[model samples]
Target chain A: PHELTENQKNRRFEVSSSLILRNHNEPFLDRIVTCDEKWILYDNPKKVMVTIWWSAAGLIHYSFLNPGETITSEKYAQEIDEMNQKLQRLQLALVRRKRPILLHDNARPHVAQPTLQKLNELGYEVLPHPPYSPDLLPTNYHVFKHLNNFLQGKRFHNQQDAENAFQEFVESQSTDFYWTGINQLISRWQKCVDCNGSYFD
Target chain B: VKKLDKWVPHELTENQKNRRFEVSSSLILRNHNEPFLDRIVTCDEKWILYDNPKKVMVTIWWSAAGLIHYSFLNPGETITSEKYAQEIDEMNQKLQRLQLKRPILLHDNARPHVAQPTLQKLNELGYEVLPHPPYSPDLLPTNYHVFKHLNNFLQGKRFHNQQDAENAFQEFVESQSTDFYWTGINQLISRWQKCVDCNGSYFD
Candidate 1:
């Protein structure tokens, strides 16, 4: 790691200049939205087990939680469709404000072929994500950990019981915690740019 | 197969939440559809730990579909006595009801299964027990799905003593519906289909 002399500096400056010249020709502000879905086995201490599906969209869309009793592939698709409407609203708002966006998410079931086709038909590009990169997702880093902790030691008598408990937990959560999660997501996107298109974090 | 996406808080200092997600997703893929499904054998185990001699209740399972079956023993079981053999027999009896004439594939990690009597009994019963492979819980649906649900159900639930824990487990059993067991069996069938699709590599 020796310091560069004037000649070395000049050579480095040329390399940096060439890099910037190439960067100026490429796309900017790639608005990638990282999304993933998770299933929670909502168990009550005495009632039937209910599988609740949760879909999150870059911490911007409402974290859509599917009620367990109505969980079917069709229902899942419907919930996602509704969630997409919200996402579209957000995108349209951005469009009206003259902003460009790109989106990303894990290869979850709800985001399979049909879902992607629907999104594309709505005019959005899906950002490809490398496998085994959950550290890159903010919810993995922040949001769900709190939810897990909140449910610790909780005993539900049934699915409805668990749902009520889950509601209470969500309601009791602080706005600061939620915003912190969202901010973390935005910051990760910002880092993607900082690393010159590589999200190092 | 369902995609795995839930996050647990205990993961704070352990590993990335994505890793667990990866494992779960991989399990879902491996378990899509096949001939055999993972089955839960909710039998009891009596055990004593350290200086406290108490009959700690344990839950174990065997997943099978078609003619193949595999048993996963939860580590909580404390005793390694003949009573454990009785547990095996009880499980096999339940398994026999599912169609004993079919070539049933059984897998278990317990030393009790390898004992002379256990082998002799299984052989007499016309069951083909599969080789025990360690660290392959990803291929077991109970590790992927059932236990997660059990843990979620039992989260933060503490028992004052062994009897209390057993009572809690009894409650767990009573509380669970026939649908719970059937849904898990359905998951096993789906998983077996996945295994067939993957050509036997556990990549779900």
Candidate 2:
């Protein structure tokens, strides 16, 4: 087993506690979403299937499209644009209510100067996620494994077939699907906090 | 659907492989699309305030079959807010026209995330939303691996403005060969499979 080195063990406790302090009050549930662009090879393995996903309230939203031959900035921009729209909808739910806070790991797109500028222009308030911390994000624990299982040896007759099947997989999820997944995230967060910079069992 | 494969690889005898495959396949089918991780990004303010020090951007990455799907966002920018909802709607339409499957939206907890209007829009559009933990990056693979590379590529590279930075990102993305893109994504897919093998418990 790859046990934490001395530095990591100490840092884990500190990071956990920091998370707890930030998450205190539990008003408006906290979510740590994992996002990335995926390219699915359809019946025509030559074509690329581009998609974006994140977990929320026990549901996994997996969206896919075709990314042309090259990785265009427009492709990245389009993905970000789609995600922002969803986040916007979620934020509006809190209108005239207690505003919820979102914690994120500092990935390049999240910290990209353009992203940051766009966020500012859009009027979002983002916090700094600690570096090299993967134990914190929940998608690592739950959604991704499900994805691998679903896509294993999965061959779609066409892009349409693949996209439709992917939708079927997404729609098939139950609330328990998310409840169990989110609980793991909460458990880990509490463990890190309780350990106080020490390793948790 | 394809018959499930053996999970034990070649480590065991035929008898063991059959037994293991039967049990693992059963488990896998039962837990098909079962939530593996729940994540949410939280921002300080409900809206993206240009002046706020806490404002930030968020992105999540998930992988399967050597393919990686990622989404990005500013907590304040959402579909419910009619101001920008039009743009979001346009994007969704484009995705739909292209036959894009709806994405799993990862958001930082904020007013928009919990908003009824937002949820309604997502549901109508056939998208799944993931719940998130506060203050955790240790779980996000992109943070652990991919993002750093992106940052390093941009460090000390002065940009004339947002457009300049975006151009650089575009260039960076274009520079990657298909193999390069899949290579990075395959690494993530492997990590996901590893987590599944470990039953959702990972040390690092």
Candidate 3:
């Protein structure tokens, strides 16, 4: 707390000045698409569950699991491939571009052998996420911070009810809102370097 | 394994879909319009990762109600079918200890989950396995659904040691209301219903 001011201001300033240096910042940031899943727990007399995956751009793919199913490596491999094609066809300008770097947390399904093989098969490179990197995952921190905020007090009586509300949430945002989410990643990582990088390797 | 790019996970073949439908339909028929949920023993497993970058890869096996068996794998080791077979052995012992159900055993098929040794133990126990369709990729969303909350609780927060993480996880599970567990259990019927309704595709 004592050195908080002078220590931060100068460092923050340095990062901003250097933002344009490689300027690979924008190209790298733009070509990148990050994905994470969330469970929409319908709020009501009865609650139903729906799992969804969304990105900095917007929602990508999602599904409802059979009651007793567990996320096995085999299934995640398929979803990785599924999202790969959707990326190419989307031309969201967030194009796959020979290979779009995929940013995801290293959950078991996300990191298993078959899933790794699948990524290699698709020729997609996964951004190397450590076992725990909450500081860096934009989806959980940024997108969800606001995304859940919008639906915070909301209620869903039915599964369809929850899904439609999600669409509303999806379309309501201006494109920049998402861009803002991804871009903050740059700010925070620098923030990471400044503050906690002292601690990490 | 033959690597095929076009293979979509959970794309149930026509017969695959029908097979799931028949099993789902039969469960309801046998269910007598009652969930028999009390008799339902759904099983789940997850790797307990640690703060030191994947410390203990502990596999915790549990049924929704009472039976539980957990084991810690060594640092350099990973999980395999033989491990799952052993896990089944422990699970059966605990079920007997609880003196519990010849309960309906439910689990989705991971590679080890259905391997021959795993099945051999399952058969020796005289446990009736729930007919879960291998094609149900849609089923994955369920595994992570309830546990996702536990994951959220784990977000960024570090425990100095693996046991501390274990304690915290137990605390999180302990803090939950019975209603939440009940909700998770009852939802399986809805899942089975939708699995059948969607023709084994997934609940859309």
Highest DockQ model number: 2
Q: What is candidate 2's lDDT per residue for A1-201, written digit by digit as tens? A: 166654455344434433343344232244444454446666424455544445455342346555345334445445556666776576566645332233444544444334433433343333223345566655545665676677787777677877776677677777577556655755786676455434354
What tens-digit string does per-residue lDDT give for candidate 3 at A88-164? 66765743343455667756666555665565445454443433455567777877667789888888777677777
Misplaced by over 4 Å in model 1 are A1-34, A42-77, A87-105, A108-111, A185-201, B1-204
For each candidate, give its TM-score against the true structure: 0.33, 0.40, 0.42
At residue B158, what lDDT does model 3 achieve? 79
On residues B1-204, what C-alpha lDDT tens digit does candidate 2 reach at each position? 110110222233433322222222222322232222222111111111222122324322233211232233444444344423333355456444544222544333333433333433544454443332332232343444445456678666765444454456556645655454344433533543343353333324
**Model 2 docking grade:** incorrect
DockQ of 2: 0.01
| C-alpha DockQ for predicted model 3 | 0.01
Residue pairs of candidate 3 with colliding backbone atoms: A65-B138, A66-B139
lDDT string, candidate 1, A1-201, tens digits: 133343333222222222232223332223334344444454412333222222232334433343433234454445556655666576664533322233233445433434433443344433323333354454566655666787777776555666666567667866565445544544554343343333254
Q: Can you tell me the CAPRI class of model 1?
A: incorrect
- In Å, what is the interface RMSD of model 2? 21.7
lDDT order, best first, reads 3, 2, 1
Q: Write the per-residue lDDT of candidate 3 for residues B1-204, one digit (tens) a residue.
A: 111111244444655655455445434433432245665555455556666455665554444553255566666677776787887787777766875345556666544445545544554555545445455533432253446667788778877777887777677666766566566666666766676566545454
Best by TM-score: 3
